[PDB]
Amino acid sequence: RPWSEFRLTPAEAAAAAALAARCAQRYDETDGPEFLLDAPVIAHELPRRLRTFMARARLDAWPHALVVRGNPVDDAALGSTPVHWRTARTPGSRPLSFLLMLYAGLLGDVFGWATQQDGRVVTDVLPIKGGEHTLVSSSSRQELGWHTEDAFSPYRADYVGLLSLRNPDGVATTLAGVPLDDLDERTLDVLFQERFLIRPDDSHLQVNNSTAQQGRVEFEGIAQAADRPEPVAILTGHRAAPHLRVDGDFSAPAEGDEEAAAALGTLRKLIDASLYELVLDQGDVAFIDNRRAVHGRRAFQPRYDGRDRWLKRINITRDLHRSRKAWASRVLGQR
Amino acid sequence: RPWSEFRLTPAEAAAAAALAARCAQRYDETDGPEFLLDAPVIAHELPRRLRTFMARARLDAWPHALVVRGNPVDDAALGSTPVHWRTARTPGSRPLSFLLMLYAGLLGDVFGWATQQDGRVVTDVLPIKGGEHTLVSSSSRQELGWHTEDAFSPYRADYVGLLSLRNPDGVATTLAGVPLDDLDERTLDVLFQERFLIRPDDSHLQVNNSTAQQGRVEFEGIAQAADRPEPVAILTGHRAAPHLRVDGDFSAPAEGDEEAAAALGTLRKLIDASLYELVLDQGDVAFIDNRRAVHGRRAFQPRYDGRDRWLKRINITRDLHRSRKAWASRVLGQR
Ligand SMILES: NC(=[NH2+])NCCC[C@H](N)C(=O)O
Ligand SMILES: NC(=[NH2+])NCCC[C@H](N)C(=O)O
Ligand SMILES: [Fe+2]
Ligand SMILES: [Fe+2]
């Protein structure tokens, strides 16, 4: 498989769950300053075989994601799937939010965005009625097209963490790496040049945040990136193992640059044809390598009956200080 | 103080020492592939108050270094200071090398350079007879001028770790941060521009490595950086908290750029005047923030009697994959 996989034993999974439940008893909130600081050290108490997997697999050269299977979830304890992210911090989902945060702390520094879901660090992926055909993660009937998370931003996550609270119909997450087996050298050369434009996705729009949040100055920086994007490369790093920065629904060539456009159009077709599926069943956790892979989610028919697919999500950076200019409480944004 | 300081209790220090001694009993070498992979997880067993300090202090906005005082060292067990780094992996220093590696694993991914001390990850700082007036860390009578470690390279460490095995005369390490209180806006503007040159320091020269190592192809890349340096900036990141890349003895303006030269000359004088001292006594460990601070070492008169000042040293990155293009066994270099 193109990702690295780990399966908890039932005893390991129970121990991790018990640690998260203890955290939920001892801290008021996952995003509070106290748990943000303490979670990386508390995670040292997770099952050792899991800590070994996370410490080693992050350093491997090849995986598109790190996948951990087998966390127990009881639908009766979890409760119904919220109708909106605003009300999605339910008591039934609270221990599992702490659990995701603990796993994330083994990989890096967690953070959020002032412009996304009210600046929350642990965010929610669930279908919002009336928002089926949008470009944000609360879509359903329209596929979420492949993209680098927050491609517009130099401060985008290194890893995107996902914990599947429920997914009864097995809706697939989509992934693709760099199609290096099919990129000719000239096309590769062009993709490494600063000849492309990449704008903020719709999740950072004020209409996708609560009222009283539309006044955050960080939305100004989002407007600047959408109205005046600066040219950037799509590929960076080692030509034999490039890092990837692209959004299928927001990337464009520089104005009038037809050679850049040809390279991007070629890349689109290669990624479309190599896109593959990862199904996060209930209790599965994935950390997607946001430099090696683009990701999306298949179209699906929402239920709106209380048992819709529901993920918790978290952004992770290897170095919080890389985003110093955007520090707005572990919440990023710029004027 | 401009750095963040932690002092082990005697019991904490004994526990950390016992963990390192166990590591030395169970692994053949500090730089072996096995201990390189295992050390970050073994470090989870270090005293919890120290793990809390390392997890929190790395995320603070201000410190130039993280300093840990109080590791016991017995000069009789340690043995005499080696006459050269080649023979400096003595049994008496072996547990303390494991200890430095364990501490380092709390901060990031350790690595070495094919061109420096035979590609070792744990390296040695000690005075080499006849090499008193050099630009490398085995100098003595000539001050080691302030510099960003491996300023020439985009793959330079985020943190430089130092463990003082002995320092009987209290010779000071030197540090300085960005002199932001005195840089006018125009000078700051220029330092943020790609108008400077920075060449590899003498530690990467073949004459400062063993024979049979002069044939490594990685020395080719060092020659390229010294013969054909590309223009770079000295400051990057947030204008209110810039990251720093400069070498007092190897930085230069771009050819004929007199405004760049004025900015660099101004920066030199401000750093000279703000340089301060940190004395690593026997058993003290420091992790210098190589993005916030330049560092050096005061001139001193070497002894050459077996009790000279002696440090173990290690390079740390927050993200090993940033250097993928230079991956040569956790040892970096390029053709
Ligand atoms: N091509 C796209 N749809 N890009 C935007 C992706 C959606 C965004 N990451 C979200 O969480 O809502
Ligand atoms: N200005 C300088 N002396 N630069 C080079 C510093 C010495 C180098 N870091 C070493 O370990 O030997
Ligand atoms: Fe995404
Ligand atoms: Fe140094």
Author numbering:
A (entry chain A), B (entry chain A): 22 to 349, 352 to 358
Sentences from the paper on this structure:
We selected the 2OG-dependent hydroxylase VioC as a model enzyme for active site reengineering. VioC catalyzes a regio- and stereoselective hydroxylation of its amino acid substrate, l-arginine, to form 3(S)-hydroxy-l-arginine, a vital step in the biosynthesis of the nonribosomal peptide tuberactinomycin antibiotic, viomycin. The catalytic iron is coordinated by His168, Asp170, and His316, with His316 trans to the site at which oxygen is proposed to bind. The catalytic FeII center is coordinated by a conserved His···Glu/Asp···His facial binding triad.14−17 In the case of halogenases and engineered azidation/nitration biocatalysts, the carboxylate is replaced by a noncoordinating residue (typically Ala/Gly), which leaves a vacant coordination site for anion binding. Reaction of the ferrous enzyme with molecular oxygen and 2OG generates the highly oxidizing ferryl (FeIV=O) intermediate, which effects selective H atom abstractions (HA) from bound substrates.
Stoichiometric replacement of histidine by MeHis was confirmed by mass spectrometry. A 1.6 Å X-ray crystal structure of VioC MeHis316 superimposes well with a published wildtype structure (secondary structure superposed RMSD of 0.2 Å),47 with no significant changes in the location of the iron cofactor or the imidazole planes of the axial His/MeHis ligands. Introduction of the additional methyl substituent on the axial ligand displaces an ordered water, which, in wildtype VioC, forms hydrogen bonding interactions with the Nδ-H of His316, the Asn311 side chain, and the backbone carbonyl of Ala314. The substrate l-arginine (occupancy 0.8) and succinate (occupancy 0.8) adopt similar conformations to those observed in the wildtype structure, with the l-Arg pro-3S hydrogen apparently well-positioned for selective removal by the ferryl complex. The wildtype enzyme achieved ∼600 turnovers under these conditions, a value in line with previous reports. Remarkably, despite mutation of the primary iron coordination sphere, VioC MeHis316 was able to perform >400 turnovers, with no observed change in regioselectivity. Replacing His316 and its coordinating water with an axial MeHis ligand has little effect on ferryl structure, Fe–N bond length, electronic configuration, and spin state ordering.
